[PDB]
Point group: D3
Chain length 291, copies 6
Amino acid sequence: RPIIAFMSDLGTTDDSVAQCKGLMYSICPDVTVVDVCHSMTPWDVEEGARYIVDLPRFFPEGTVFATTTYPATGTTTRSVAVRIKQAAKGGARGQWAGSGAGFERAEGSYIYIAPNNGLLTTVLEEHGYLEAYEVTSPKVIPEQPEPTFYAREMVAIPSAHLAAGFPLSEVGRPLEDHEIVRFNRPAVEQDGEALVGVVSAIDHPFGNVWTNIHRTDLEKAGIGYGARLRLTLDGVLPFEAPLTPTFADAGEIGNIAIYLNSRGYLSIARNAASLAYPYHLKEGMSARVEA
Amino acid sequence: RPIIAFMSDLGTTDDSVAQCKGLMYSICPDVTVVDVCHSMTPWDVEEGARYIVDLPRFFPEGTVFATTTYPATGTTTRSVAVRIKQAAKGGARGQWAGSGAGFERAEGSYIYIAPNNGLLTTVLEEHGYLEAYEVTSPKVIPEQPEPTFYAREMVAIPSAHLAAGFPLSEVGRPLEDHEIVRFNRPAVEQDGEALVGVVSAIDHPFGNVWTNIHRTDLEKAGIGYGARLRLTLDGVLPFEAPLTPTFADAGEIGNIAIYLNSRGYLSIARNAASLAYPYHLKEGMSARVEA
Amino acid sequence: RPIIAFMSDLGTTDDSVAQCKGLMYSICPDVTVVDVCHSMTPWDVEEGARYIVDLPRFFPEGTVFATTTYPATGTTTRSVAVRIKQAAKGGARGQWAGSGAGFERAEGSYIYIAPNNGLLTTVLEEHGYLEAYEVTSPKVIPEQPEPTFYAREMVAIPSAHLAAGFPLSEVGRPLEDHEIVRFNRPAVEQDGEALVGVVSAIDHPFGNVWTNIHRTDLEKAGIGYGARLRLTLDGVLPFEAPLTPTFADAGEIGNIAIYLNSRGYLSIARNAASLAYPYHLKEGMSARVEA
Amino acid sequence: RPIIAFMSDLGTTDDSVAQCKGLMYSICPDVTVVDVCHSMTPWDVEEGARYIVDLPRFFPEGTVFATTTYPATGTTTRSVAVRIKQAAKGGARGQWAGSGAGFERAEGSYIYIAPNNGLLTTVLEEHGYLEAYEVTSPKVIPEQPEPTFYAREMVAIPSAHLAAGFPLSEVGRPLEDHEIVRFNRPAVEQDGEALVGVVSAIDHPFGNVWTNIHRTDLEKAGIGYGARLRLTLDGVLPFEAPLTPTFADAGEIGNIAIYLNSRGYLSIARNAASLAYPYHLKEGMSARVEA
Amino acid sequence: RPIIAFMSDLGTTDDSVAQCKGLMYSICPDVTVVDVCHSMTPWDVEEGARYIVDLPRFFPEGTVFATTTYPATGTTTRSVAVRIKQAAKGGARGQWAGSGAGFERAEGSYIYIAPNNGLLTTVLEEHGYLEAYEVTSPKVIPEQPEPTFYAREMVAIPSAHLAAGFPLSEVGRPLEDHEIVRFNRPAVEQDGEALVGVVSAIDHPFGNVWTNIHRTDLEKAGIGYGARLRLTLDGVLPFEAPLTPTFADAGEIGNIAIYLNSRGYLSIARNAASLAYPYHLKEGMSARVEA
Amino acid sequence: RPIIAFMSDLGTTDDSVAQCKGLMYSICPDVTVVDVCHSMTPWDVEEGARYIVDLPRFFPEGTVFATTTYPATGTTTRSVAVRIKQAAKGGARGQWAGSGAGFERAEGSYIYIAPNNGLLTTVLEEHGYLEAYEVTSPKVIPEQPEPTFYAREMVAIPSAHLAAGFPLSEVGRPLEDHEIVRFNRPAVEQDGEALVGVVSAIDHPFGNVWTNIHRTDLEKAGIGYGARLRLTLDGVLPFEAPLTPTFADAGEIGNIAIYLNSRGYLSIARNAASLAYPYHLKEGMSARVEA
Ligand SMILES: Nc1ncnc2c1ncn2[C@@H]1O[C@H](CF)[C@@H](O)[C@H]1O
Ligand SMILES: Nc1ncnc2c1ncn2[C@@H]1O[C@H](CF)[C@@H](O)[C@H]1O
Ligand SMILES: Nc1ncnc2c1ncn2[C@@H]1O[C@H](CF)[C@@H](O)[C@H]1O
Ligand SMILES: Nc1ncnc2c1ncn2[C@@H]1O[C@H](CF)[C@@H](O)[C@H]1O
Ligand SMILES: Nc1ncnc2c1ncn2[C@@H]1O[C@H](CF)[C@@H](O)[C@H]1O
Ligand SMILES: Nc1ncnc2c1ncn2[C@@H]1O[C@H](CF)[C@@H](O)[C@H]1O
Ligand code: MET
Ligand code: MET
Ligand code: MET
Ligand code: MET
Ligand code: MET
Ligand code: MET
């Protein structure tokens, strides 16, 4: 029962994703295409990375992640197809996903195929990989790929072959690690006792604010649940609350919750109210937290 | 061929829905996950209710409706899983859905799993239920649920177990009726001969205006198709049109149509033009109807 | 493994599409419903046409395209169901879609079912058709169709019967060609040496500008890749670039690329930057091009 | 104590009006410059006309109205300077302005100087004129006028000479009536008993809606204060109220007032609430009124 | 050399203010009309109050303040004309305005004429009054006032008579104190050691945030310059800065300054950046201060 | 008859300017205060400079320009008061302003008083100065100036003393040239034959685009009226038109006019249509021009 989980910047306002899906069903008749999302900021490889990094543990083993923003479409660039190593635990706590104790996933159980443009940076960081290949075989990509639609040609199409059981090592030549493009992930710096990062994302549609300050950055600073925090956003907007597991811990609706999100990072929200929207808080604003 | 029809407030801009779906396929490999919608106003249980109440008759019997906005995520709250009684006719007329005379649906043929937060108020109102259980079993929910992600932990996960044939009564303790949280559904009042309600929704993306004045409410006044109505929105807009079956009955494009929507409610629109958008009409504005 | 590819104006903000899908799975238990998109401008038949015309070559043979904007919902109008002739090559170059040399699609391999309101004009233009029928049989549509929901009653539902193998010729009487409503496709005019058309679409979410000036119109002017072009939008913006295969050919990020999009049309973008959005360029603006 | 009352489209965001004023004080040291307004929609001669037509009765005799939108600036066009005849009563009732019984103004007591572009159409209609001259004398305009600033050169400057006592007949040659450009003022038509006009203006900053239906159009239709009116706006938005002298007559705050504005025209408003803004009502929308 | 300082809600987008001014010059030929502002929120008497309360010390003795938002226009209501008592010091410090030690203003040296709608509440509070009269005499108001234009009829006109030396006591009957309408000025409450008020205004066009926590309120807590304050806006923004005299005291551009504004009120801003606009801070949001 | 022409960033939404005016009339009873404008972008000294540099030739000799954006308000900074040298011709052509051959202005005839923050940079550049003084004397500024209102304390107030005939040299110590803060005026660069500058301003309310490319820069390139120009905005919009004196020279309404504005600068507009607004063109965008 092959799955392709499909994350793109293609949007859902035209038939672009459907073209890809048509081809996925063409190539892998029995496939299930799962949309991850298609609304990532176009060409923002770091943002795209966020939508795909945590996926493996939730998916059945053998799932192929077709993940693409492809601003280098139509160039001599070729996608990378990698088998990841650890499906990797996640969340505020770091666990296997699912009922009971969760579902453990065997190593080497997921393939990502993406533009070799750094999209997979954090996937590779968090999961490691067992093998990586340049996607060049005309068995898995068009001989004449549409210049402006490498998302389809060099990701959707070959992901469907991979889902169909096309041997990964046959999509093209092995890539050495240095040949896998990566983006530099900005460090959470320590400025005194304070951890200084950025708003990594606004958690739509809630307006929760996610920072790139991980629980590990917090552990590394001696802050666990219950710790009274000052979280300053945008070097202007100050917030103060204990670190709590969840939103309702803030008490009243609208109260500030500082918490660890489901991806494991320091975040801030109002309890059942949007924090980000009324204040127009945005991804990329500084996030400083201090006890 | 089990189906989970999934309605959440999770949006489609990140991988949150995909995480739930990954887990649904993990748990119930042969499941078809049908998106209901994921764009509901977060935490607005009355709005969420509107997207799920009409669903059963459309779906094959045995469908599980995983329906969730979960502001109380991470609290001691637990979801409720209910087997509804009547699949219930619907529409302007009140009929089975489908070709011919429609597909009659057996009773007790659908399960809803939702936060016990009132989301299912109108589902229970319109369909009744045969049994309801608190969702507590570690067989169907994580032993260590992600605090901020009960949509996944307490709805998506257990829904897939239910879709996989996990016995409903084994999800947890039977809930007594009074233990099923309900929201108060504001009544359509009679102010003289006029029926007084609200705009229940703007019917996106058309900008049609839906009221909570149901066909049955109109029948209480003997208002049927052909009746020349004054529909006053926001207190000051005495729209006038006969009640007609459809938009084109208004005649010229842009003409006011007063009609019964597909959910059976008194609605107002322009014929092949947006009524609500140009004039910024909104849910919650008063609506009054009379002949 | 039947597929219904479903393109509507229903949006994805409520359960409307899900109701259609529920019925599609009810009627055709084995079906895979692939969303094309549901965000088309309501009632804009010409725009809806763009999202469906290029679909066939992407999909497995036997796919049914349920394509609908239905402003005449509730009227005596009835859908048209057509078996197209040529799946037809497409793209900047004009080729079969897929890996290798692409997937050749047999003739007569796809059915569209749509309102008979011109939605299928370009489908018919580009693919031809072998047979067209009015969709009237209560075997494939409701006896009492919901007045305001013909998208479901007269498209979704019968599309699922067609997917389920209901004989096309049994949906109703054959339509003669003149009975299939067409919209007039505005011609690309020659104004001297310049080809004059319109911005056909803003390519969301990138803000690329698509014109209705086809590759064929360009190679009729001796315009091929490498030609230095002046492309004037909205009658005042005389962008200049060579015609290149792709965005990155513009060089620096933000530079103007004039290219043939994946649908084969003269288009203009910035390289990995939005062209349309900063300047609020829009569909329907004039588009002039000269070598 | 000479007054120039100055109405332009120059805005108040830069020093444009100040340049004009500087010159007015240069030429007429003892002048008082009164700003009428400078925010009229640029080049909208009909809208500009509204801001100047009612002015004379409020001003001391001898006031010069410098009134300008000048889209033909820098052309061979020359301003017209006219001495009006009747200062003319105004208002909902038609009276002299001021305390007691008002201040009667002698005939021939005001000069307008404006581009000869129709700006003065309604001034001439409502007031008549005694003499009109083309403004060409280098005694009153620059020998080398700034091409893009005829508002200054051909209106502000010569208005200051006129205020200073420069003989009007000496600014240039007499204009025959046909040489005074006029705009066609759209008629309030009778469609049955209903009077059909347009929203002439949104009365900022209140959001009151003014129509071009005059009390005389209403008198001519048998509607005076107390008459129950239906006023339909934009051929969509319907309103109903008696014709009342004022806003507070509507009763509750927010209630619909249909009234005659201070310029004498049928208008509609909410009582101490904005009508136009929440509904995005605009100038140019149809205004149909019926009893 | 009489001055009328004119504050209305009339806006500057049409000729309404000019009509009033024309009449002011008609009645008092030698008057200087000073615009205070005309952009106040219509009908918001508390906001209007803020624009007029601080005016007297700035103006030459004998200045008439014509101050008006007149929602009760056209009713039996009549304006009030008051001679204030103390011109009153002001500012962060509480001082006479002007160079050197400032211009001391005699008592009883200013008249306000306003609707008797509470607009003068804070004027009377902060300045006291010596006499107050209802404005009823046809010597100073129209015998037939334009119903919808009492700003002109009952304020502008009589103000000019007052400016011309019309005896104040002759405008009409003396009003007893209780006959002068007042609005309730919400108190700055003490919630522990914190002072709890509201954002009284956004200081346009800078986006500074003004509170109704006056210097005198801070003095009640012994809060002076240098005190490290927590200023919480909207309930969740614990701004922290010392109370400083000015913006630049915050140091770097964009740093938070907590200060006493020129009206003497606790305020918060960024240094040479907008505080309110980026975060959409608004009048009426809660404000709390403590050391 | 002294004049103070007052340009500030104070806006016109509150009584701030009126307070300044009150004091100006207090200090200089005979003065006429002419508003230049009060809407300049706060703290933008370069933009403020544009509104004041061209003023002198328009005003009667002896005019005082009180020009202020004062982000250093409340600091030890003190205003500069300068007597300029040349009133200087201006416009597209470079001429005295006024009727006939214009009004020649004697040298040393105008005083500017401003924060010493570079606001006067272009004033000094274009007019030169004869004398400059630091404004420190308590005869012309408050002994205890309001910390946050130096616009009033250090500009308005002393400007009125200067208007009143207070000797300029007595306001404080002479400033040496190096003590008068200047901003760096970005140069118009030559990039080949093309002149490269910036959009200096959007000319509101018309949406004309002004560049910092001066007539002098054009006639140094042999560019005069009639020259066919390519003017590229924002690095992507290569508008083409001949250089013409005025907007109407573009022909049809909406056509592109490239012209020299009234300040003498290369500008681009549409003929009686907004260029800047539809395309959201902005100050600071690159502006390139070539013959
Ligand atoms: N203007 C664009 N520049 C660079 N890449 C673009 C642009 N528009 C779309 N794309 C990319 O094309 C990929 C299809 F293969 C899409 O997913 C975009 O990332
Ligand atoms: N800020 C929030 N406050 C309360 N609940 C929230 C917030 N943000 C998201 N949620 C809920 O978390 C659920 C996942 F379990 C989402 O569906 C939200 O309803
Ligand atoms: N206001 C409307 N006028 C005409 N058609 C409409 C309107 N709103 C929705 N529709 C059509 O109803 C169809 C379902 F049958 C939707 O797909 C809309 O096209
Ligand atoms: N783009 C423009 N086209 C035509 N007229 C314009 C344009 N911009 C400004 N103006 C007119 O110039 C007059 C100055 F004399 C202004 O008052 C505008 O009406
Ligand atoms: N819609 C309105 N309701 C009540 N008062 C209003 C309305 N529009 C304007 N006004 C008042 O009329 C006054 C002139 F006398 C204006 O200053 C408004 O306050
Ligand atoms: N937030 C502010 N930072 C620095 N200066 C400011 C701020 N708000 C207002 N100002 C200046 O105060 C001056 C009056 F003296 C105003 O003109 C602003 O320039
Ligand atoms: C915190 S609510 C759960 C969904 C959310 N978008 C997340 O990924 O964590
Ligand atoms: C308005 S046509 C059908 C779709 C609509 N949202 C409905 O539920 O009735
Ligand atoms: C612009 S890159 C590919 C997606 C685009 N919407 C297309 O149809 O070609
Ligand atoms: C109706 S309130 C008075 C001012 C308004 N703008 C008018 O001209 O009538
Ligand atoms: C903010 S600087 C001075 C102007 C301000 N609006 C005030 O009244 O204090
Ligand atoms: C654009 S026409 C005249 C007004 C313009 N703001 C200028 O300074 O030239």
